[PDB]
Amino acid sequence: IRTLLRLVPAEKRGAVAGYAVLTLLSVLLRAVGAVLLIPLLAALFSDTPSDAWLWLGWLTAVTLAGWVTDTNTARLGFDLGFAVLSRTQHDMADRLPNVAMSWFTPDNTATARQAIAATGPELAGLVVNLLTPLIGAALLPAAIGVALLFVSVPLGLAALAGVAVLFGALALSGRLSRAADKVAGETNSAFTERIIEFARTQQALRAARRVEPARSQVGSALAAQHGAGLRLLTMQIPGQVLFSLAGQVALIGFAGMAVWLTVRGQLGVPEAIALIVVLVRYLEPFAAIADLAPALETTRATLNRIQAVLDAPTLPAGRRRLDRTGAAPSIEFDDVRFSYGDEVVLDGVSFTLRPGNTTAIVGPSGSGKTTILSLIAGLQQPASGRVLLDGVDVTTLDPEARRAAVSVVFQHPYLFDGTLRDNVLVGDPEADPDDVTAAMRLARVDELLDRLPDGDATVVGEGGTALSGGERQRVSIARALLKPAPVLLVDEATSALDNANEAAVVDALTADPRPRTRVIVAHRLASIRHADRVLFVEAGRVVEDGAIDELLAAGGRFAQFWAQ
Amino acid sequence: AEAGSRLLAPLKKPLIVSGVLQALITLIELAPFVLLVELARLLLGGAEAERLWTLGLTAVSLIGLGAVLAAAMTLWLHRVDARFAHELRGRLLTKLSRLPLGWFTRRGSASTKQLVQDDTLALHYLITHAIPDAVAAVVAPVAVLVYLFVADWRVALVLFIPVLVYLVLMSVMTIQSGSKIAQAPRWAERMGGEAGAFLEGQPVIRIFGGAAASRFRRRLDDYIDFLVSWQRPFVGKKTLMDLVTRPATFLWIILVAGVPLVVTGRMDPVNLLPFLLLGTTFGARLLGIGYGLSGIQTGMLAARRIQTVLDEPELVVRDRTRPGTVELDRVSFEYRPGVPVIRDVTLTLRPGTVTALVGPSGSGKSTLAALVARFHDVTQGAIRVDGRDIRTLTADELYRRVGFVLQDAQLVHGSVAENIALAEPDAGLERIRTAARDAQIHDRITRMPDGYDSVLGAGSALSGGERQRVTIARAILADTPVLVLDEATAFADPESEYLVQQAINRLTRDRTVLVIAHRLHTITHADQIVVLDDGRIVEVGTHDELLAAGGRYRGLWDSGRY
């Protein structure tokens, strides 16, 4: 299979050569072991059965060598299977944080989820469970045919004639079911994305009464999943019928040549009886191929999903680093253009932030404020134009140096399932308890520890689902403040917090003692307290900017914004 | 297992028949080799040609009959399994529709996916293959060995050596992997949770630590360590079972015991023909169930997990059995036992009134909204809609009486027309444009490439304030007598916030509305303002009354100006 060799590590290519040699050797030894019965029983049925010792000795050597070969083939298949598992999974884990954010469509997120979900024992035992019996079952009839040439040339040709029928059925069986199996996988993958949506959106679905399977989208995805599943069981009937005909046709071809030679004196009766046993050994791989062929098509979809993520377009990067690790950098845009698909968001934004100051961004909803912060942090990159941290382009900046330069508070606080403390520690896991306490106290997360019964060991749900809307927002603020990054981005930190907690958090965003260049995407006029500069963004450009008193005095769009 | 027998009760007669059919089939699959033995015995005996053609052709056809019967039997039994899982999967989705919502929060969306999809898929071998493989692995070794033991006990005893070694290998393999099999589904749930959070929390991972420090990378390494320690001894015992049970292994040990008996005057070579032809056949049946004990162990565990959820408490609609009125009486609630979140709340919401629910963060105002929705039952007290308890109302009646916006603007994978018409999917586009127009989202939807058909999948189509205005459009289209707005217009700008609020006042003029807001300047117009501090109502009154009281509300109002 072409796809799997692409995923093999380069360091293990010595093991694949050894595996292939032992795999071919396994087939050769098994085939020689089968055809070694023809002289053995011919000598055993002869008038001198003592001649049978020579062929039993060779049979013992061939069988013992087979056990050693197939044990080593199993060790290498296990090592190669898990080496591909850890290599691909670690590559996808490394690659995905660098994959472009435009790649995470609902279809690709399903591909990445299924690709990551293939980590189980089924993919790991791929080489042991599929490749080894598939290669052996496919090549064993051909090796017995080649081995039979030393007993009788036309008999070996007849056994090789049925080999061609085996591959004819093997190619056609996959061809017939490929159309239906693709739909079965696609409908089964959609059903996965609806169960996750079903569990993640229960409140909205339940209120809307779209939760019962007769009325729900997951119920519709289940009906399509069942119909495509039953269709696959039906379109696989031709493949199993076709393998049965191949086995029967090979049986007629093998047995027809054996009887034809026997009546003509070219093949003794013990040799003919011995070939009945070789005929059964010859025909067992025909049924083994039939059972393994359906599993071959599901693997091809599994490896394609894994290769789909590995082929995903990583984002541009360089190897530059900032002149100082912790000094406050200047943030500036130089005619930044950006668009989601064909829908433009930004059309020539150009500003410059002084290092170590705090500036605010305000504007209507859907203006582009969150996009601006994403571009600064490097989550997005411009379609054209450039973003410079301390005069150094982020697109040419090291992923490590670029990642370490920014800490952000997102508009929709997402917390990983775990303890409350583990989510704060994500900002800086190496920080000592004195630093973690300072971050929590600034973000008013210390008040949560008193009220909550488990304190900082409170189990956060999926997202911040097991916390209130305002509680998870402060856990997010503590996470951002803990990180020592010299650039702080804040996105609607006020949305879920009451008036008392909002004021303390807003003061804490500037009372943080580190020198940082701060960008505050805010909602209220009070939320932009202590702001050294204000940027008003509307329709994808900074239409107006200045100080709070300056803009209010001018009575511009900044003043009209608060007038409702 | 009791939880497995209860779940698989509908398949009692299909599974009994599959066991009976396979006993007949495997006997039919062994008949050709009994006839080929007689064909071989008569070739040496020089019998008449027409007698050989009878045995030869009957044996070849019986191979075809067994292959046809075997293929047909697995086809029907696979369709019985496919239809059961559809019946079972729909049963689970029906059950999950009714469970209290704390079930979903304490579990996650990755465990629900494992439940509905993976655990039902884990029952495949138990239903479709376990009984066919067990009856084959019993009757075929038993039928062959009894036939061969009559033929020659000396060589037949030697056939027990690989049989006993196989039984020891699978038994040792079964006890070793028994613990790992039970631990396996928990790891899949954890990795699904980590993988889901890894994909969903990508902006957090990209900025905080990247791949190296991510929780998923560590759990990924730990999971593979579990797999290697699980699979190395399991695969190692699997291959020895294959080597022991292979036809080449049986044939070699038949000849090791046979050839010295034939070379010496202790056995005729004719009597080896049953062993050569039939002795090598029953090994593949033995390996069928030996490889299958893991499928039975995983399936029996999955059936236990499935029946556990189907036995869960359900938020039953009890038969105990002013319009638009909602009364809370002595309501208390606990997300977890012994952790009060709501404490003896008594409140009444009347038609043609706006009630504002305010207070500190984490005081339980979203919990009160969820209780009215009956996402959770009140631990104490009662909540009555239009004079009737919501525990007596059915789900259709409850959610036709009251509509909800929930502070967490969840959107489903579908068009904006499908999202705005979530409450009433049969509603027309003219209504959808009207609801969207009132929610101040129609202009945005017009600017989309596909317009009202544009899909709202993952990471697409909307900002945070635009998602909220879509969910307001959904609530408008539902058109229920009662309305609850949990922190709505939180991300809306002041210019857009006024237009949405004015539309809500216009639509719900004569209706019950429960607004929940942290921005107290937006709820000055409320008929009554309810202050919720630490899960209890500390003061109730109008805006001026609460300011003059000088209590919690005055503190919050004064602190709003910074």
Ligand SMILES: Nc1ncnc2c1ncn2[C@@H]1O[C@H](COP(=O)(O)OP(=O)(O)OP(=O)(O)O)[C@@H](O)[C@H]1O
């Ligand atoms: N994933 C996305 N795909 C396509 N368009 C998007 C996406 N996210 C946002 N948009 C659109 O980009 C424009 C700006 O969105 P953005 O999130 O930057 O705005 P914002 O100022 O942060 O808004 P809000 O206050 O509502 O959060 C809007 O048209 C929004 O619809």
Ligand SMILES: Nc1ncnc2c1ncn2[C@@H]1O[C@H](COP(=O)(O)OP(=O)(O)OP(=O)(O)O)[C@@H](O)[C@H]1O
């Ligand atoms: N699913 C849950 N499991 C456990 N505790 C929860 C859950 N949801 C909320 N809580 C806790 O219950 C209390 C109130 O939660 P709730 O969501 O009702 O708060 P709230 O008043 O709406 O908050 P906010 O104003 O911050 O949005 C808080 O302690 C919160 O941590």
Ligand SMILES: [Mg+2]
């Ligand atoms: Mg935004």
Ligand SMILES: [Mg+2]
């Ligand atoms: Mg809330």
Ligand SMILES: [Zn+2]
């Ligand atoms: Zn099956």
